[PDB]
Amino acid sequence: REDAELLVTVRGGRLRGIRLKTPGGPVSAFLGIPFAEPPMGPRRFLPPEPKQPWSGVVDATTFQSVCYQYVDTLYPGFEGTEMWNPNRELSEDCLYLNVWTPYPRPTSPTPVLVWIYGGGFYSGASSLDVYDGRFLVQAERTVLVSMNYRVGAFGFLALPGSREAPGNVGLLDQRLALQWVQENVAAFGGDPTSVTLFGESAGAASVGMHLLSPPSRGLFHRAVLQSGAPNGPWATVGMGEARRRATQLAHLVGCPPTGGNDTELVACLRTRPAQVLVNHEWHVLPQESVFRFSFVPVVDGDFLSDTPEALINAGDFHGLQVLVGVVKDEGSYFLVYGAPGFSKDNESLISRAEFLAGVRVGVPQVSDLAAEAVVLHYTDWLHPEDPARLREALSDVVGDHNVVCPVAQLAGRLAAQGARVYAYVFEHRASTLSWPLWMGVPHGYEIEFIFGIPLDPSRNYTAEEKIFAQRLMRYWANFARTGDPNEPAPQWPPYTAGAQQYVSLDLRPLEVRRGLRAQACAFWNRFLPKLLSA
Amino acid sequence: DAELLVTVRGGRLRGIRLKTPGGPVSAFLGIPFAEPPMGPRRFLPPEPKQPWSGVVDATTFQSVCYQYVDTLYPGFEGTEMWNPNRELSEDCLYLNVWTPYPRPTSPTPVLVWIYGGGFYSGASSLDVYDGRFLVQAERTVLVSMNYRVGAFGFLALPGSREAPGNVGLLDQRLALQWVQENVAAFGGDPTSVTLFGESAGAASVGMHLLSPPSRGLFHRAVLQSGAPNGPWATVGMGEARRRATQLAHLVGCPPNDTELVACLRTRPAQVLVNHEWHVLPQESVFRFSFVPVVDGDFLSDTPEALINAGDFHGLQVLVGVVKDEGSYFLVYGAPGFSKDNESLISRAEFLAGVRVGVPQVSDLAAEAVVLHYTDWLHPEDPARLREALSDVVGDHNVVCPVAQLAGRLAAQGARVYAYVFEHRASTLSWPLWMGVPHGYEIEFIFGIPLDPSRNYTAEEKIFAQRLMRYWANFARTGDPNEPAPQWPPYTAGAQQYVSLDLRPLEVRRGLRAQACAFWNRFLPKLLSA
Ligand SMILES: *[C@@H]1O[C@H](CO[C@@H]2O[C@@H](C)[C@@H](O)[C@@H](O)[C@@H]2O)[C@@H](O[C@@H]2O[C@H](CO)[C@@H](O)[C@H](O)[C@H]2NC(C)=O)[C@H](O)[C@H]1NC(C)=O
Numbered sequence A: 001r002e003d004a005e006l007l008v009t010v011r012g013g014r015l016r017g018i019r020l021k022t023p024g025g026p027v028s029a030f031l032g033i034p035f036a037e038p039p040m041g042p043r044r045f046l047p048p049e050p051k052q053p054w055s056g057v058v059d060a061t062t063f064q065s066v067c068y069q070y071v072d073t074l075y076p077g078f079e080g081t082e083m084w085n086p087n088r089e090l091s092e093d094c095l096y097l098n099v100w101t102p103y104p105r106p107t108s109p110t111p112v113l114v115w116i117y118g119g120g121f122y123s124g125a126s127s128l129d130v131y132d133g134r135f136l137v138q139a140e141r142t143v144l145v146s147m148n149y150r151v152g153a154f155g156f157l158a159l160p161g162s163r164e165a166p167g168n169v170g171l172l173d174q175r176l177a178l179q180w181v182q183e184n185v186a187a188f189g190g191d192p193t194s195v196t197l198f199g200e201s202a203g204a205a206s207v208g209m210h211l212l213s214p215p216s217r218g219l220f221h222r223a224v225l226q227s228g229a230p231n232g233p234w235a236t237v238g239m240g241e242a243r244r245r246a247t248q249l250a251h252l253v254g255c256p257p258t259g260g261n262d263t264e265l266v267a268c269l270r271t272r273p274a275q276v277l278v279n280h281e282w283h284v285l286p287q288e289s290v291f292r293f294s295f296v297p298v299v300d301g302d303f304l305s306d307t308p309e310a311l312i313n314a315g316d317f318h319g320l321q322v323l324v325g326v327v328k329d330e331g332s333y334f335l336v337y338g339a340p341g342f343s344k345d346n347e348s349l350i351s352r353a354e355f356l357a358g359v360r361v362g363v364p365q366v367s368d369l370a371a372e373a374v375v376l377h378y379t380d381w382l383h384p385e386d387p388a389r390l391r392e393a394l395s396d397v398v399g400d401h402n403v404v405c406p407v408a409q410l411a412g413r414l415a416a417q418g419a420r421v422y423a424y425v426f427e428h429r430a431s432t433l434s435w436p437l438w439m440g441v442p443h444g445y446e447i448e449f450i451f452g453i454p455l456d457p458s459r460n461y462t463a464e465e466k467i468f469a470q471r472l473m474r475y476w477a478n479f480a481r482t483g484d485p486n487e488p489a490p491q492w493p494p495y496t497a498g499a500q501q502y503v504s505l506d507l508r509p510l511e512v513r514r515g516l517r518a519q520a521c522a523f524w525n526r527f528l529p530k531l532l533s534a
Numbered sequence B: 001d002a003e004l005l006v007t008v009r010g011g012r013l014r015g016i017r018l019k020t021p022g023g024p025v026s027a028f029l030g031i032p033f034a035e036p037p038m039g040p041r042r043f044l045p046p047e048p049k050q051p052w053s054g055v056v057d058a059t060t061f062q063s064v065c066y067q068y069v070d071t072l073y074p075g076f077e078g079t080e081m082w083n084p085n086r087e088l089s090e091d092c093l094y095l096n097v098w099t100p101y102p103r104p105t106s107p108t109p110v111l112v113w114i115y116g117g118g119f120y121s122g123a124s125s126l127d128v129y130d131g132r133f134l135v136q137a138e139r140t141v142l143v144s145m146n147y148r149v150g151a152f153g154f155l156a157l158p159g160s161r162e163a164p165g166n167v168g169l170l171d172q173r174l175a176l177q178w179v180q181e182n183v184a185a186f187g188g189d190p191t192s193v194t195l196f197g198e199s200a201g202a203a204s205v206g207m208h209l210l211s212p213p214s215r216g217l218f219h220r221a222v223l224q225s226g227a228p229n230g231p232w233a234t235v236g237m238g239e240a241r242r243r244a245t246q247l248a249h250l251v252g253c254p255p256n257d258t259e260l261v262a263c264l265r266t267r268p269a270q271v272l273v274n275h276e277w278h279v280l281p282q283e284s285v286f287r288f289s290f291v292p293v294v295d296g297d298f299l300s301d302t303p304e305a306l307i308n309a310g311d312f313h314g315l316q317v318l319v320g321v322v323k324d325e326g327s328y329f330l331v332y333g334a335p336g337f338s339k340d341n342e343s344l345i346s347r348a349e350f351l352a353g354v355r356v357g358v359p360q361v362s363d364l365a366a367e368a369v370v371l372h373y374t375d376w377l378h379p380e381d382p383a384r385l386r387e388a389l390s391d392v393v394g395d396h397n398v399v400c401p402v403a404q405l406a407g408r409l410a411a412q413g414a415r416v417y418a419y420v421f422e423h424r425a426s427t428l429s430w431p432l433w434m435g436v437p438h439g440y441e442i443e444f445i446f447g448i449p450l451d452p453s454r455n456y457t458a459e460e461k462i463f464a465q466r467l468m469r470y471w472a473n474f475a476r477t478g479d480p481n482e483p484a485p486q487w488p489p490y491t492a493g494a495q496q497y498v499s500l501d502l503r504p505l506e507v508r509r510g511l512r513a514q515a516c517a518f519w520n521r522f523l524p525k526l527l528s529a
């Protein structure tokens, strides 16, 4: 008849799951649990409404739809890009979450890891193969939760002050899922008092925004931020620029028959097919760029009462443990998406003129003086025109500006204001990587190791890569359990604003180093803001 | 002795025979080349010396031009060696000629030395500028002149005929004209004149390079630890007028240019000297009150602009710096510094020192300096902070202006040779933390180690002979090289220079290229926007 392990009652009703095989043994999975009412029709752009209770048994036996989003077509059929594309049908009916728990169900409350996917706030899905939670749960005996949240215009189009499209509803989707975890994770054996958020890129930025938003902060205990931070130059937008982008998108799809009554404008937007909005999404950006996304969280005083930078500097973070880090080559992946002279299919040995033009694309919407300051710091004036050095320098510009230095600033300020911080740099290039060698260890390619994907027998990772993945899963689960990645062996010291110690994650044992590109990040974090103001 | 009797255009001279370890030389010291700029002639351009009857006694140095006397460390060798060693006088426009003995009967290349001293001090009579060893060892003619310094040489009420400014530079030019007309009577070749100078003397050399009336008076140029494009070597017309006006007020004179200068001319020379430092707009190091003014006459534009717009084909220049250009100046005002301790400053003192070492810039500019010269992995290490502030002062005032001059001249047709002088003299009296300080290559260029009464090592005597050979080789041919390894020319791309030390030449790339990109390429854009 029924497997009692695969049957769970939550607040809304009864669920039926599936028993998953893993290389290490069985795991219980409840995939596609509805946590909100479908944000369709009149509910497009609105905050999520909690899922109404149901009679009978909901089959949570497969991943639900991917939230409607742009699909990348830069390199069709190429594994390096297709691995990030939707692997389920697109739909606005997409507010579902997933729970993995050990088989049999834990008998005592078990620490919970909650994953928030990245994707520049315009893409992503909890169903991607690289976010498969079965290996972590089996290997480390935690409960793992992941949720879908609205992206692009559907999640982050904002007419600030309006009731019809207030913005940040994609973040409210995440918060509702976190509230669902608090109310229901115990039914799966999870400990609601030991919830660790973790996420990568825009997912890491989301984690940070939940840290800085008091209504979210009560819903979790620890945080992990991989290759992303809320204080990046891409992760938030001001109210005026958000209104300008939303108004231009409406104009590009014929609404209204520009601006005017917000209620009328949104009502017209709600009549457009979802794909019509997606087709014009990228056109509302003020200039050609890399690492910039049209509809992102808006700083409007509500979800974020101030800029993440201000909230970080003004925050008391005693009692908080965070784990943060970057990959070795954060900037390289983004260059083939607009920087002149770049391609995955050649060595991208750019000229000096291409480097100077690339700086304006990688640092958009700054004064000519600011761009000259960037050129000053990233030119080797003994080799100003060397194509190989210019390629790596532009990668450093984009990676430092968008990822490394925002992460370093967050790590240093949190540590100085009471938090226990652990920092890493991920330095192993996967044997299965399909991107060219010049990209190094690109953005996003630590995730598969954190999730234990090398343990999948159908994949062809080396044996030592499987050992490496098991080590990383152990660090992450140790942190979730205790707030300390170290095993209760070379030790991982906390990051502090003074000593600035971090560890290198690679096939070799831990190596302790100092400074997350300290000289470069002093420019981005300490001087360049002063320049932009004067 | 007929070798010591010379007739120049103005009349007859009697010189003196001098001893060196390598043999005798002929010296003619204290030759008047201008009418004494006294009384009504104060602040005015020099007038050529009128002819005289009889024989001028040219056997001893003449008076030092009126100037401030350093009293930071009284009796200390390291400072006293720069102080006046003859009586001060406004009657000071004299020059000196050294020739081989017996006097050359064939035209000999001429070296003309212009002393430094921040345009406020200096004298051709200082022991460290003794030309006897260069003349004997390398068989050149050596000429050095006194020129007016301080307010007497560079007080300017721009537009006025009573105090036009730059008359100290005109003193140098008049001496250069005197060389053209008279050096052949000593055996010198007026068609082979090489200017060399250090610090403000090097800045002076560069200004003669950029002023067409001076360009026809010499052939090659050597610029040691100085350049005309520094932040200290020139002043704008408005600031010069403000400084001249403030000086008058400080000495009890009214604010009309004719009445102001007339009152200034009634004051004793020492009175002007006593108030010279107070007309500066703020407390600082490496800033001087009365310097050349850019008013469109001697300099038709800023030295920076003239260098960028110039065609320098047919020019050969020798330029260079010492290893630690900034250290000497730190004890003259940076908080926490002294020659008598290790000067291990704090972060707060470093930040205060930046405003002293980079005066009269915006707060944003100062923050940019702090950014580039902070090691953000060791932001508060006192030894690093000491070295960093020395780099700030040295790069801003000497190294990067020299690097900019070298690169632009080379890219625009000149043949440039660049050095870094890295030997600390065994006789140096300054503390070890100062390294190889500003000004302490001069004694080696002039062959002072050859003086047996001094305490230089045998190695240092050979080193000095090497340096004299490079300098004289350059004066003779425009190329310091002997027929080593070779000293390659400096170019804007390769940026090659040599290290001058006891060891053989080593070729290196970049005169603090990363730091000087900040000072030369970025910081001007920041200050203007
Ligand atoms: C902006 O317009 C809304 C909606 O107005 C309605 O839709 C318009 C296209 C048009 O058909 C109007 O006649 C409709 O009333 C206004 O909200 C409406 O306000 C009126 C007055 O209270 C009310 O009767 C409607 O029910 C309201 N509709 C909704 C959906 O809230 C709103 O007041 C207007 N604001 C302005 C013009 O500043």
Ligand SMILES: *[C@@H]1O[C@H](CO[C@@H]2O[C@@H](C)[C@@H](O)[C@@H](O)[C@@H]2O)[C@@H](O[C@@H]2O[C@H](CO)[C@@H](O)[C@H](O)[C@H]2NC(C)=O)[C@H](O)[C@H]1NC(C)=O
Pocket (backbone or CB within 6 Å): A338, A339, A340, A341, A342, A343, A345, A346, A347, A348, A349
């Ligand atoms: C490296 O590749 C870029 C990208 O060009 C594309 O990919 C190449 C592999 C090749 O298939 C091209 O035809 C593709 O268009 C080259 O930059 C492009 O150059 C072409 C013409 O030179 C120009 O029309 C495109 O706009 C350029 N694209 C970008 C993004 O700059 C680049 O020249 C290649 N480098 C080489 C060949 O050294």
Ligand SMILES: *[C@@H]1O[C@H](CO[C@@H]2O[C@@H](C)[C@@H](O)[C@@H](O)[C@@H]2O)[C@@H](O[C@@H]2O[C@H](CO)[C@@H](O)[C@H](O)[C@H]2NC(C)=O)[C@H](O)[C@H]1NC(C)=O
Pocket (backbone or CB within 6 Å): B333, B334, B335, B336, B337, B338, B340, B341, B342, B343, B344
């Ligand atoms: C290093 O010396 C400086 C200079 O102080 C002078 O020289 C010393 C050798 C000694 O003789 C002092 O008494 C002299 O005043 C020191 O900087 C001074 O510090 C005092 C306080 O102790 C302060 O009142 C002065 O203003 C400072 N002067 C300057 C120019 O900053 C410095 O503290 C010494 N460093 C040490 C001892 O580590």
Ligand SMILES: *[C@@H]1O[C@H](CO)[C@@H](O)[C@H](O)[C@H]1NC(C)=O
Pocket (backbone or CB within 6 Å): A458, A459, A460
């Ligand atoms: C691993 O290699 C095998 C053998 O060629 C192949 O069948 C399989 O598709 C590979 N796995 C992946 C994930 O590509």
Ligand SMILES: *[P@](C)(=O)/N=C(\C)N(CC)CC
Pocket (backbone or CB within 6 Å): A084, A117, A118, A119, A120, A121, A200, A201, A202, A203, A443, A444
């Ligand atoms: P962040 C900017 O969300 N990084 C995303 C775009 N990556 C996509 C390859 C990793 C999810």
Ligand SMILES: *[P@](C)(=O)/N=C(\C)N(CC)CC
Pocket (backbone or CB within 6 Å): B082, B115, B116, B117, B118, B119, B198, B199, B200, B201, B438, B439
């Ligand atoms: P420049 C600034 O003229 N060099 C001076 C300071 N030195 C004197 C101590 C060298 C003569």
